[PDB]
Write a protein that binds this ligand. Structure first.
Ligand code: A1ABX
Length: 284
């Protein structure tokens, strides 16, 4: 069923809450035993958001390999994503260790450091060229190279150095700065513009490690970004664009991380973004 007609049918019937609860009921439940070990309590931002054991990213160290991060792998679309929480004061070094070890080119940030008057993640990148950051626990150095501030997002060029080997890499930081403190954006135009800028950079392409995507918990806004990207790529690759079922794609993604799409409003916004984005994919 063409999703645009499914959309108008749910909107006229006002059944978004009902569709959303159906997804919550059918979603996968896998063990998260490593996340719940007492040694890992200060590595989790939220007690109720954990990576499944089967899909968690492992740090390359014998001490403690744990980070709150999941690998979402899609075969047909040919895309992989790492979804993670906003880093904590004691996990900023683990965060950059993961980017290094997984060979990521891009970091996608969908939150502000402060929202609703509370801290939603650590200040984990340098704000001035001449004031670099050193992460002594993981032996990494991070330098701000350049910053491009636009109305709806900022793009930063960062240099990450492995102090152990003196290898360096360029990391691109894509920061969506205008998601509202409450609800979802009224139009998906600025979110789709941002998605297309990440795509254009090479950050989502198979010659690199998976993109790292985060918000505060790494399930809500983060879920919306990967769901929209994958659905638009499937509409491109297939003979029948209309064959794409956004609810079935979301359930596939929830096999790899719990809780993706946190509200019925986030589900409606994801539909809007895919419907409006398809009017480019199909030749405009
Ligand atoms: C029917 O489900 C298919 C197609 N997908 C939905 C698009 O209609 S999927 O790409 O999310 C996917 C992912 C893993 C396994 C199977 C599937």
């Amino acid at each position: 069923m063409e999703m645009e007609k499914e959309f108008e049918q749910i909107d006229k019937s006002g059944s978004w809450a009902a569709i959303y609860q159906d997804i919550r009921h059918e979603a996968s439940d896998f063990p998260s035993r490593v996340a719940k070990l007492p040694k890992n309590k200060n590595r989790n931002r939220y007690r109720d958001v954990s990576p499944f054991d089967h899909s968690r990213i492992k740090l390359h160290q014998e001490d403690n390999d744990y980070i709150n991060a999941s690998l979402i792998k899609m075969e047909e679309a040919q895309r992989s994503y790492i979804l993670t929480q906003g880093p904590l004061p004691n996990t900023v070094g683990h965060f950059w260790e993961m980017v290094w070890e997984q060979k990521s080119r891009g970091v996608v940030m969908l939150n502000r450091v402060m929202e609703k008057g509370s801290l939603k993640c650590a200040q984990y990148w340098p704000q001035k060229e001449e004031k670099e950051m050193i992460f002594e626990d993981t032996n990494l150095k991070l330098t701000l190279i350049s910053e491009d501030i636009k109305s709806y997002y900022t793009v930063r060029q960062l240099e990450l150095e492995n102090l152990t080997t003196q290898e360096t890499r360029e990391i691109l930081h894509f920061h969506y700065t205008t998601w509202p403190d409450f609800g979802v954006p009224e139009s998906p135009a600025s979110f789709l513009n941002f998605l297309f800028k990440v795509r254009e950079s090479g950050s989502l392409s198979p010659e690199h490690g998976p993109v790292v995507v985060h918000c505060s918990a790494g399930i809500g806004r983060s879920g919306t970004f990967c769901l929209a990207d994958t659905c638009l790529l499937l509409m491109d690759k297939r003979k029948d664009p209309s064959s794409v079922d956004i609810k079935k794609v979301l359930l596939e993604m929830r096999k790899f991380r719990m809780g993706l799409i946190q509200t019925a409003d986030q589900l409606r916004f994801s539909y809007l973004a895919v419907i409006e984005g398809a009017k480019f994919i199909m030749g405009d």
